[PDB]
Design a protein around this nucleic acid. Structure first.
Ligand SMILES: [Zn+2]
Length: 647
RNA sequence: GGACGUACGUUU
RNA sequence: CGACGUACGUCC
């Protein structure tokens, strides 16, 4: 409630009436700077005129937090504060909200959708655009699209009452720059994309930030992996047998994906599996039934190989028993789907191998040395200080649960309590305040950024465990980049204003140039009637003449004959988006297919099965080729809009 | 469902 | 120096 020199020096360049790239690591500091700038902006206007400051929050939690803070602050001043979110902008006059409010905190995607539709034609209605975590303004972000619209309206020659573009962040960032030249070039490009000539950074009151800055210390621990990999050897033999028995129907399986040699349990092998799957999903045997059987068998074999590769990665990273548990869970989930010859062979082979796999996994001599040293350093820190709440960063959503199960089943430790955030001593998270003075990045590659919210100094460690010193060197150069970016900011604060502005202007110019150069024309709409087939079944789903478009993004089918071609399933997490209500999922209605086709929702009153071309193959009736797309934007055809007059 | 970003990996 | 695959996170 009382502004200090630290909170005032960052806002001093912003009160003069110029854009800024204010960089404050303190979470409370950013909110206080927001409030002070908003007060000084709405108070400096004379009678008759009024501000329309807009705050762009990226996430819903920080959005609601800023909304509550602004509504609690600007109450006695006589200012109307509101909010527009994803669950609040449904059939609501956003134009009337903007015209009757002054401190709207609408998220950026809402403003992008409004600019695309036609509501709020010019941004000149606003007067002060305060972004949150502005360093995301890089490419195709909602922030970047709002800035593209602003720069277009500015350089177009109709620059009216343009709003201020004061941005707030914690780290300006470097990206892929190598030397100070490319670092300064990237920072200048960001400053031009956000249209500012000042970067507010503390230089005279560094002690106020050093008091609470949350600067931890790194303790990189390069450790080795297992040696006697009996589990990995058995899984590799199983995968070799599976590939050998799968090559009986496709003699040219090796000629479909030509990259390099492949090894089981690698991301390269996973990519090769996905590529050979997408290559075997386009077969054109004229039988149309044996072809479907061969495609289904190849899809099942490839899915089994992918699951085995995922199990090998889980065995390499987390405990050995967790990989066997994941394989048993996958086999139990596929057992309750269908029983054909392919499943009756694969599941029976896995059951034959499980009698040895369980005996190998239950051996205490095959424990991961990475998990061993992890529990070692954990118990070390815990008996050194028994009041250290920790956070453990994991890469995979399966490993973040495997480590929780390991901690729950580890006899060497009992004080730990799993606090998974995909009565809580350890918080095993995957990707992200004022607490948790211990971080353990377990094979997870800035990603430990905690200086965006509330923080506290006086004790913080940033242990990093890994198996490849590569990653170590990576983090090293990362710290290097941190330093160099600091230096670059210093240089910018040493630069003059006018020339700087001129430079950034030229930058924006070139940018717009590139933009107008990268403007694809309308795709030539195909006039033929191509049909879509299932991925793992190759069954006739629907013709492109019965496909309708809702909002240039969603695709449905109006064919009543299609209504019996799928089955419904209760959605694991129903939620609303824009104008839809996610009610259920639609899967393939075949013997043992159960392929994920799409999602059954309700648009306004009508029930529609919104499908995804990703889970579809395109076969033309004129030519005969079977092309395979990923996104609807890549599929070019007669995109007929959704006409509610028909159904 | 669609868009966006990040990380890893493969390639002309 | 562009596309591609995966994982993660966000948004509408
Ligand atoms: Zn099917």
């Amino acid at each position: 409630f009382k502004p200090r020199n630290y909170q005032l020096e960052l806002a001093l360049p912003a009160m003069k009436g110029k854009n800024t790239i204010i960089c404050a690591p303190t979470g409370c500091g950013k909110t206080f700077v927001s409030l002070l700038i908003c007060e000084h902006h709405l108070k400096k206007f004379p009678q008759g005129q009024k501000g329309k400051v807009v705050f762009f929050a990226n996430q819903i939690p920080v959005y609601e937090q800023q909304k509550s803070v602004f509504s609690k602050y600007f109450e006695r001043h006589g200012y109307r504060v509101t909010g527009i979110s994803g669950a609040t902008a449904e059939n609501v006059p956003v134009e009337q909200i903007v015209e009757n409010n002054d401190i709207i905190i609408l998220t950026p995607q809402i403003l992008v959708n409004n600019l695309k539709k036609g509501t709020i034609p010019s941004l000149s209605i606003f007067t002060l655009m305060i972004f949150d975590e502005c360093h995301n303004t890089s490419k195709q972000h909602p922030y970047n699209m709002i800035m593209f619209n602003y720069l277009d309206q500015k350089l177009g020659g109709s620059s009216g009452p343009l709003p201020q573009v004061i941005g707030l962040t914690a780290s300006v960032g470097v990206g892929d720059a190598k030397n100070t030249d490319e670092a300064l070039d990237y920072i200048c490009k960001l400053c031009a994309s956000l249209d500012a000539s000042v970067i507010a950074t503390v230089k005279h009151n560094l002690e106020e930030l050093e008091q609470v800055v949350y600067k931890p210390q790194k303790f990189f621990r390069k450790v080795e992996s297992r040696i006697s990999d009996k589990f990995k050897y058995i899984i590799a033999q199983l995968m070799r047998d599976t590939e050998s028995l799968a090559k009986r129907i496709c003699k040219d399986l090796e000629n479909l994906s030509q990259i390099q040699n492949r090894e089981f349990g690698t991301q390269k092998y996973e990519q090769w599996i996905v590529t050979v799957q997408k290559a075997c999903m386009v077969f054109q045997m004229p039988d149309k039934d044996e072809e479907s059987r061969i495609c289904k068998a190849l899809f099942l074999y490839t899915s089994h190989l992918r699951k085995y590769n995922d199990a090998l990665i889980i065995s390499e990273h987390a405990r050995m028993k967790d990989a066997l548990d994941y394989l048993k869970d996958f086999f139990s989930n596929v057992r309750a789907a269908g029983f054909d010859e392919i499943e009756q062979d694969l599941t029976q082979r896995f059951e034959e191998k499980l009698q040895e796999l369980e005996s190998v996994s239950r051996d205490p001599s095959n424990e991961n040395p990475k998990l061993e040293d992890l529990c070692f350093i954990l118990q070390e820190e815990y008996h050194l200080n028994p009041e250290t709440i920790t956070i453990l960063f994991v890469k995979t959503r399966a490993l973040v649960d495997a480590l929780k199960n390991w901690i729950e089943g580890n006899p060497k430790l009992s004080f730990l309590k799993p606090g998974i955030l995909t009565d809580h001593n350890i918080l095993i998270a995957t990707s992200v305040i004022a607490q948790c003075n211990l971080v353990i990045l377990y094979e997870y590659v800035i990603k430990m950024i905690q200086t965006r919210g509330r923080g506290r100094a006086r004790g913080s460690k940033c242990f990093l465990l890994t198996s490849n010193a590569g990653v170590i060197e990576k983090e090293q150069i990362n710290m290097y980049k941190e330093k160099m970016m600091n230096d670059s900011i210093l240089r910018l604060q040493t630069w003059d204003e006018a020339v700087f502005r001129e430079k950034i202007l030229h930058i924006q110019t070139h940018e717009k140039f590139i933009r107008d150069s990268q403007e694809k024309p309308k795709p030539v709409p195909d006039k033929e009637n191509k049909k879509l087939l299932c991925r793992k079944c190759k069954a006739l789903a629907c013709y492109t003449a019965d496909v309708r478009v809702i909002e240039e993004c969603h695709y449905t089918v109006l064919g009543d004959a299609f209504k019996e071609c799928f089955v419904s399933r209760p959605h694991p997490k129903p939620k609303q988006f824009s104008s839809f209500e996610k009610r259920a999922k639609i899967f393939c209605a075949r013997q043992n297919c159960s392929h994920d086709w799409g999602i059954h929702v309700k648009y306004k009153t009508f029930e529609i099965p919104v499908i995804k071309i990703e889970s579809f193959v395109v076969e033309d009736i004129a030519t005969g080729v079977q092309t395979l797309y990923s996104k609807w934007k890549d599929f070019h055809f007669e995109k007929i809009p959704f006409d509610p007059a028909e159904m």
